[PDB]
Amino acid sequence: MHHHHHHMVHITLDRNTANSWLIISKDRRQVRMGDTHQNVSDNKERFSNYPMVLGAQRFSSGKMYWEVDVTQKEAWDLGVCRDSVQRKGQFSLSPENGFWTIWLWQDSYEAGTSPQTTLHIQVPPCQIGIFVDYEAGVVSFYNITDHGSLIYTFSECVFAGPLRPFFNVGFNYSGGNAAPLKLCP
């Protein structure tokens, strides 16, 4: 029988896209910033300038929902992006460039609108839910630590083809950002 229900997709990390200093777990569900270049070959899909990686999953219709653990991290970016986004060089995270993201940077949460939007979060998230509804043109972020309170919704999105989960683990020169981003094992 038809029943309104939630469904959480299993996201795994695409090692070929990962910046070469990222350490990805054997099950491809966690990623952290390493202190050495890893034994991985460069290639065209790999993010060169930032500690970024894509989910392997790719979709161009329907609904997708996944959660990410961000505990003990002082910096990260999360969301969804076009399959076709730039991998090499410096770039801003904006819908203009094919990214629908939020981030934490120096104790401030922001949405990656153009220009950036301050997010007034009362309870720092430990887990974040990311929902995409392709046909609706919606990317929504939820604060699992605050009973799933809505953090931000991008609406009227221009997806313009296949999408990928997007992650930035942030740098760890400070020593306060070693913890991984984690997807459900």
Residue numbers in the entry: 283 to 467
Please, what does the article write about this entry?
TRIM21 plays a crucial role in immune defence, acting as an E3 ubiquitin ligase that facilitates the ubiquitination and degradation of target proteins via the proteasome pathway. TRIM21 has a unique position within the TRIM family due to its ability to specifically bind to the Fc region of intracellular antibodies, resulting in the degradation of antibody-coated proteins or of non-enveloped viral particles.
To further investigate the binding mechanism, mouse TRIM21 was used as a structural surrogate due to its improved protein stability and high sequence similarity to the human counterpart. To understand its mode of binding, we solved the high-resolution crystal structure of the murine TRIM21 PRYSPRY domain in complex with suramin at 1.3 Å resolution. The only species-specific difference within this binding site is the substitution of lysine (Lys464) in the mouse protein with threonine in the human protein. A notable exception is the outward movement of the C-terminal region (Cys466 and Pro467) to form a pocket that was completely occupied by a tolyl moiety of suramin.
